[PDB]
Symmetry: none
Subunit: 128 residues, 4 copies
């Protein structure tokens, strides 16, 4: 903890948390994502992507259209504040982003953009 959180995406298309809080004193924040399941990336890949709650749907829709090879994210999507790579069973990836990119009193969402996963794999992030 302290300017970091560890999150897991499993073979049941679930993240193990629905809410992340970022302490306003952190200059940067790190998310460390792992996949504890046994299914591969092409079947059950997960990423953790952060955007405003208003932008989540356009990011998910354009992410599906970019496809597989682009980790289901539009290249240089300006609405994505930070994201990991798409990972499979046994893998891990971290992303560190500057907390100054987040406003107090704005709602943010984290989600996975693998096709169909965002319906269940999503949660809120808020500054504290």
């Amino acid at each position: 903890a302290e300017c970091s959180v560890d999150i897991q995406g499993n073979d049941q298309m679930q993240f193990n948390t629905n809410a992340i809080t970022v302490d306003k004193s952190c200059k940067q924040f790190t998310v460390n994502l792992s996949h504890p399941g046994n299914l591969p990336k092409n079947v059950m890949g997960h990423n953790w992507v952060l955007s405003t709650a208003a932008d989540m749907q356009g990011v998910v829709t354009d992410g599906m259209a970019s496809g597989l090879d682009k980790d289901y994210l539009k290249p240089d999507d300006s609405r994505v504040i930070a994201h990991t790579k798409l990972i499979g069973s046994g893998e891990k990836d971290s992303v560190t982003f500057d907390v100054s990119k987040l406003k107090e009193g704005e709602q943010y969402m984290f989600f996975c953009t693998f096709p169909g996963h965002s319906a269940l794999m999503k949660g809120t992030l808020t500054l504290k």
Copy 2:
């Protein structure tokens, strides 16, 4: 035919389609919604609401807040392009709207605003 679509929302909280293409030649377009289930409106009510993808989240959140009596939609919400009433088991409702309200290049989303249903009851609509 052609400028209309029949959509069902059932007791599994799912629509029977997640993509609607509106033909550029239609002067108007009709959505015919029915609820083939057995559950009452106060527990599994569904409506079909249209907005841009960017506005979806605000419409769902203010909708949730307006309550069952307002069909979970903010009264006179300017972000709502077109909508049906909230219907329960065995009911039907239709909405016809002007296609000039849509423009090519914009991403639209249709969804249900009953609390929690948009997680699964959502789809894209595009003018082609």
Copy 3:
């Protein structure tokens, strides 16, 4: 219609129906499955598999263990009343089964066995 149904599974990991009624006057019933999406079989393949509600979990878990080469279905699983092949984008398949293999008073479920899909891709089949 009546002694056959057309079903589709899409890129949003959803079937277009979650309840099928088989008329007792049908001696045989045909299910025609299509995949109207763009994702390939190994990422978003779908099949239509029928069993009793009590055997669905067993069929899904062992199906998952059999892998893609087995269309995610255990070879000669006796709990499966009928099934299609696993199809990907733009493919289709059909299966016909005898209605006397069904009895009134028993709960049946149709579902997809591609890993993770059964949570949303499932529905009831009832003999009426």
Copy 4:
């Protein structure tokens, strides 16, 4: 904590955990469910129900058909190992059950039976 777990069901149809482990040395185990949301029971009611993974579908289908007044659970359902009542905003309920009712090498699932919630509100319970 020791032989007990605290779990929350929110307005986004999410449990705050998706995996419960019960230690074999516990003579009994307690689940304390709360609803930190603002939506009422008819809209977003949640309960915690435990059965084998095999029986979950039967419990969910029959639960749906029992009605709001029956807390969407079939009265005296033999397949339910333990359950809470259906609670709404600001409510709380607990269930303590005998760990002798669980056997090793059997898969258990906990889920909510409010219509449409089990697709998202479900997790595994394991005896170690």
